[PDB]
Amino acid sequence: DIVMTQSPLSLPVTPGEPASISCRSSQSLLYGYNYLDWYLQKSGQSPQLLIYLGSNRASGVPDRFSGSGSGTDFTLKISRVEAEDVGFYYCMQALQTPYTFGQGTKLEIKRTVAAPSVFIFPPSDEQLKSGTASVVCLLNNFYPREAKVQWKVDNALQSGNSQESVTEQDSKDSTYSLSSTLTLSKADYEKHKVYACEVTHQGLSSPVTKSFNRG
Amino acid sequence: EVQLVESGGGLEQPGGSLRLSCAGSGFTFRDYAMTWVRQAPGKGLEWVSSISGSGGNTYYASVKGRFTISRDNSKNTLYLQMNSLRAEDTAVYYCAKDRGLDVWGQGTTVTVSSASTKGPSVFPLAPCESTAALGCLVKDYFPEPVTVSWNSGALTSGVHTFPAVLQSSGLYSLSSVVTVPSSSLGTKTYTCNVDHKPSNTKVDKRVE
C-alpha cells in the first residue's frame, strides 16, 4: 500500500495564528491531478471533506483553508485558526485501492488559564438500594487540561478506587471538563460520613475542596 | 440535501456476522461509487471497501474473504455483509459518497466480543452559588454507544457528556451533566434522555 506520513502529530495553536500540516506519501500521487484529500473530524462527528485532488476546497469550506503540493509532498494550511477548528485532520490518497490515511494531526487550541468550577454529587438512594455507591466529582470548563483530583473519605486519601474521564476540547470556549467517579460498596459508604473531592489546578491559587456528609 | 443514513451495527461474538446498511437521499445514488471507512476505538481512519456505481466492481482491504460489499440501487442503499467477525473488526463504520469523499454517514457501531448486551441503570446526580450542576449517571451497560440529550434536545448549552470508562467488571459507565443558573432551580425542569439502542433501553429521568 501507499504509506501516508503526516506531521506534526499534535498542533497547539492560538486562534488568529496560522497552522500548517504536511503529508508525505511513499509514492507519487500525481496521476495537474494529485489524488490527495484532506479530512477534518471534530469530536463526536463524522469525518468531513476539507480539500480534494490536492487543492480544491469542498463546498462550504472557507477561503482560509487551502491545500497545495504535488507528487509526494502536500500541505494543508489554515491562514487564521478559529476555536471551532479544534479536531483531528487527516490526509488521504485516493490514487489506488486501498485508500490510505495519515496518522492524523490533533489540532489543539491555546487559550488563557481558566479555573474549573467544581461540584460533588452523592450517590442516589435509587443506587444505594442495589448495593453500590458512586460518588461523582465534576470539574467544569477549565484550561489547561492537567488537573489533579484527590478523593477523601473521612479524611483518608483514596487511590485505586476511582476513574476519571475528560471531555474533548470545547469548540466554543476551548476548555476541558472532567468527571471522576469514586466507587464503593454500600456497606463501605455507610461506614463513613465525610466525602470530599479536592482539586488542584493552575488556575486555582490553592486546591478547592467540595464535600458532603452521608447524613 | 445530500444525506447518508447508516444502521445495522451492533454486537456479535467472534465468528458471528452482522449486516450494515447505508441509505442515500438527495442525489442519484446509481451515479456514484460508494465506500466504507472504519475507525477503531481511539484509532485513526482505515479504508475497508468500495463498490462502483453499477455494483460491477468491488475492492477490499484484512477483510478479503469475510466481508462482502453490495448495493441495491432500487432502494438507494449500500451494504456491508460482515461474516467471520474478529475482535479487530470492532469499530465505527462510515458510509461515504465516492467517484473526494464528499458526504459521510453518521456512523454505526460494531462491537465484536465474548460479552453480552446489557442495558444501563440511570441514576440522578444532584447536590447533597450562582451556578448549579445536575446530571445523570449512566451505569453498567454494554456495548457502546449510549446517546444522552437534555430536555429532549432543548438544552445544549453547558452540557457535557463524558467519554464512557470501562469498569473492571467489563461494563461501561458514563456521566452527563449540565450547569444551569441556581435561581432557576425551583421552577425549571431538567430531564436527561438516555438511549442504548443495543439493549432497546430508553429512559427519561427528571433530575430534582
Numbering used by the authors:
A (entry chain B): 1 to 31, 34 to 217
B (entry chain A): 1 to 61, 63 to 100, 111 to 139, 145 to 224
Please share excerpts from the published article on this structure.
By engineering a small secondary structural element from the rabbit light chain constant domain into the human kappa light chain, we dramatically improved the crystallization of human Fabs and Fab:antigen complexes. Alignment of a human Fab structure onto a rabbit Fab showed that the longer FG loop present in human Kappa constant domains forms a bent and bulging conformation that would interfere with a beta sheet packing interaction. In the case of the FG loop, this consisted in replacing the septamer human sequence HQGLSSP (positions 198 to 204 according to Kabat numbering) between the structurally homologous T and V (position 197 and 205 respectively, according to Kabat numbering), with the pentamer rabbit sequence QGTTS (positions 199 to 203 according to Kabat numbering). The resulting mutant is shorter by two residues, with deletions of histidine at position 198 and proline at position 205, and is referred to here as ΔQGTTSΔ (positions 198 to 204 according to Kabat numbering).
One is derived from the publicly available dupilumab (Dupixent™) sequence. The parental light chain was the wild-type kappa. The parental heavy chain terminated at the sequence ESKYG and included six histidines for purification purposes. Two 96-well crystallization screens were used with Fabs purified identically, set up at approximately 10 mg/ml, streak seeded with unrelated Fab crystals (in order to eliminate stochastic differences due to nucleation) and analyzed at the same time point (9 days). Both parental Fabs produced crystalline hits in a few conditions and the dupilumab Fab crystals even yielded a 2.0Å dataset and structure. Dupilumab parental Fab yielded crystals in 4 conditions but dupilumab Fab that contained ΔQGTTSΔ yielded crystals in approximately 120 conditions. Structures of the Fabs variants without the ΔQGTTSΔ, including the parental, did not pack with extended beta sheet interactions. The parental dupilumab Fab for example packs with various types of interactions, but none that form a continuous beta-sheet. Besides the FG loops the only substantial difference between the parental dupilumab Fab structure and the structures of the engineered variants is that in the parental structure the heavy chain CDR3 and light chain CDR1 loops are disordered.
